[PDB]
Amino acid sequence: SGYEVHHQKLVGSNKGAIIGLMVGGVVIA
Amino acid sequence: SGYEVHHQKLVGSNKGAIIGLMVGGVVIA
Amino acid sequence: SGYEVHHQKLVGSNKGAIIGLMVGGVVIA
Amino acid sequence: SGYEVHHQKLVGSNKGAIIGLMVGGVVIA
Amino acid sequence: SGYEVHHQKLVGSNKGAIIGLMVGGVVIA
Amino acid sequence: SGYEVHHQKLVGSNKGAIIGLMVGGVVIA
Amino acid sequence: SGYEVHHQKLVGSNKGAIIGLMVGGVVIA
Amino acid sequence: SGYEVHHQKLVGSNKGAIIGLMVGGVVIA
Amino acid sequence: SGYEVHHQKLVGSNKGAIIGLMVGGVVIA
Amino acid sequence: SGYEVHHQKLVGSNKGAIIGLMVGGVVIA
């Protein structure tokens, strides 16, 4: 038991939000 | 128990928000 | 128990916010 | 228990905010 | 218990803000 | 007869293409 | 006959392409 | 007959391309 | 017959490319 | 017949490229 995020690959253009793990807070994309 | 984020690869152009781990706060992309 | 972020690689152009770990505060990308 | 950020590599052009760990404050990218 | 940021490498051109650890204040990139 | 574009006002954040008049060429937004 | 662009006002943050008149060429936003 | 661009006002932060008139070439924003 | 760009006003901050008239070449913002 | 750029005013902080007229070459901002 726990939370984890691993081994991913992203390529190209970002203009929004990219987030690995979110435990709280607010994201206006 | 815990939170972690590892071994990821990102390539190219960013104009937004990229975040590994978010525990609180606000992100206007 | 804890929070951690490791071994990631980023390549190219940034004009936004890149953040390893966020525990609070505000990010206007 | 604690917060940490390690072993990451960044390459290329920055015009925004790059932050290892954020515990508070404000970031206008 | 504590906060730390280590073993990262950054290469290329900066015109914004690069910050290891932020505990308060304001960053206009 | 002719082409013209006038008296417009834009306010806020741009991350795409804003073009007054386009007679040819290519725009990847 | 002709092409023209006038009297416009833009305010705030730009991270993309802003172009008055485009007669040819390529724009990667 | 001709091409012209006049009387515009721009205010704030630029991190992209701002161009009055473009007759050819390439713009990577 | 011709190309011209006049009477414009820019205020604030720049980290990209600002160009009055472009007849050729390449811009990497 | 010709190309010209006149009567503009620029105020504030520059860290990129400001160009009146470009007839060729390359601009890495």
> DSSP character for F7?
S
Provide the b/e sequence for A1-29 (b: ≥16 CB within 10 Å). Answer: eeeebeeeeeeebbbbbbbbbbeebebee
Strand A26-28 versus strand G3-6 pairing type = unpaired
Q: Which residues of G touch F (CB under 8 A)?
A: 1-29
User: Are D4 and C7 in contact (CB < 8 Å)?
Assistant: no
Q: Which residue type does A8 have?
A: Q
CA distance E16 to F10: 25
Closest-CA distance of chain H to residue F1, Å: 11
How many CA within 13 A on the CB side of residue E13?
14
CA distance B20 to C24: 14
CA distance D27 to B1: 30
Please tell me whether J8 is known to bind a ligand.
no
- CA angle H15/G9/I22 to nearest 5° reads 55
Residues with Cβ < 8 Å from H28, sequence gap 6 or more? Answer: G28, I26, I27, I28, I29
Instruction: Tell me, letter by letter, the H, E, C secondary structure of B1-29.
Output: CCEEEECCEEEEEECCEEEEEECCCEEEC
Q: Which residues of D touch C (CB under 8 A)?
A: 1-29
**Resolution rounded to one decimal, in angstroms:** 3.2
Closest-CA distance of chain B to residue C6, Å: 5
Chain C residues with beta carbon closer than 8 angstroms to that of E29: 17
CA G3 to chain CA centroid, nearest Å: 13
Alpha-carbon distances of F10 from G14, G29, H21, rounded to whole Å: 11, 18, 18
User: Are G27 and F24 in contact (CB < 8 Å)?
Assistant: no
Do the Cβ atoms of I29 and J19 come closer than 8 Å? no
Do the Cβ atoms of D5 and D23 come closer than 8 Å? no
Chain E residues with beta carbon closer than 8 angstroms to that of C17: 29
**Tokens at residue I17, please?**
């490319």
Q: Which residue type does C2 have?
A: G
Closest chain I residue by Cα to residue H6: I6
Experimentally, the structure was elucidated by: cryo-EM
User: Are F25 and G29 in contact (CB < 8 Å)?
Assistant: no
User: Are J12 and I12 in contact (CB < 8 Å)?
Assistant: yes
CA distance B3 to A23: 9
